[PDB]
Design a protein around this ligand. Structure first.
Ligand SMILES: N=C(N)c1ccc([C@H]2[C@H]3C(=O)N(Cc4ccc5c(c4)OCO5)[C@H](C4CC4)[C@H]3[C@@H]3CCCN32)cc1
Lengths: 10, 251, 27
């Protein structure tokens, strides 16, 4: 469901 | 939120989304109380009967959001946790007494039109506003129904604080002075409640004396969602303010 | 300090669509 977030945050 | 409405843009700039990393999911609501501190419910982070015990690195806080699922490029800010502080007498065994936790962010978040901290009440704020019949406001990305289901954007509902005897008589759970309940009675005809995914989010009130928003409550527990004869229960922020101050002054 | 004053509402003297409901319940 959730749009993926910028990798920098994972 | 059940039977609430869409939030306006920038209506709740202290709103915080607790987001799980893997799997990427909504964990709870939460609130921004300064440029590095976020307040939520202890049960959002620690609940051993369900084997819940999230570490810092298990999640992210997302601030400035409106849409639930979208990555809001140039609007939201995503932050990493430095340290989680749960109330040392949070009573998950019995009744979620002292359902409160603090999260320190690794770096300060920049305030903006969409990101801004809410006030915490002092004794007189509490005394003045935490009155049966007085309405507060609850916000979250939680379910729209106890069992249409999930909102596209942040939901809002205003609810009256309920007399302590009514609160107590509505449940078999032992109610404490660290809790209050809010919601309409069946006789009042109107509806609204927090629900699954709204946990840890804020119950706010706008002081008519200085026109500022105060968070009096934290979405803590309830039985079902928006059931006739049942009320949402809220962690009483002012009552645990001593613990809050102690934490932030120490760390 | 700045707390509780929303950039898009109190700071600009705009009200949101239901804060009046709260105010009216404050006795
Ligand atoms: N407004 C509300 N109607 C409302 C309903 C439900 C919640 C929360 C919370 C909820 O009501 N419970 C159940 C519960 C409730 C009371 C308890 C418990 C357990 O143990 C001792 O006393 C949860 C437990 C982690 C503790 C938590 C759960 C998390 C997803 C949604 N639930 C939030 C709001």
């Amino acid at each position: 469901d959730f749009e993926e977030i910028p990798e920098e945050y994972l | 939120i059940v039977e609430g409405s869409d939030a306006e843009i920038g209506m709740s700039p202290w709103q915080v989304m607790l987001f799980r990393k893997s799997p990427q999911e909504l964990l709870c609501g939460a609130s921004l109380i300064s440029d590095r501190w976020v307040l939520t419910a202890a049960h959002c982070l620690l609940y051993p009967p369900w084997d819940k015990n999230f570490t810092e690195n298990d999640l992210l806080v997302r601030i400035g959001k409106h849409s639930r699922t979208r990555y809001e490029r140039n609007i939201e800010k995503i932050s990493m946790l430095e340290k989680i502080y749960i109330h040392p007498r949070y009573n998950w065994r019995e009744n979620l007494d002292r359902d409160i936790a603090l999260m320190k962010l690794k770096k300060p978040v920049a305030f903006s039109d969409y990101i801004h901290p809410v006030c915490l009440p002092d004794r007189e704020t509490a005394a003045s506003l935490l009155q049966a019949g007085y309405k507060g406001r609850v916000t979250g990305w939680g379910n729209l129904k106890e069992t249409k289901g999930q909102p596209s954007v942040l939901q809002v509902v205003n609810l009256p604080i309920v007399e302590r005897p009514v609160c107590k008589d509505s449940t078999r759970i032992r109610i404490t002075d660290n809790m209050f309940c809010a919601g309409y009675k069946p006789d009042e005809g109107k509806r609204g409640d927090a629900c699954e995914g709204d946990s840890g989010g804020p119950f706010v009130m706008k002081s008519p004396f200085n026109n500022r928003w105060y968070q009096m409550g934290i979405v803590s527990w309830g039985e079902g969602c928006d059931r006739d004869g049942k009320y949402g229960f809220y962690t009483h922020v002012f009552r645990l303010k001593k613990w809050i101050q102690k934490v932030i002054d120490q760390f | 300090a700045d707390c509780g004053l929303r950039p898009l509402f109190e700071k600009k003297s705009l009200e949101d669509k239901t804060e009046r409901e709260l105010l009216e319940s404050y006795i």
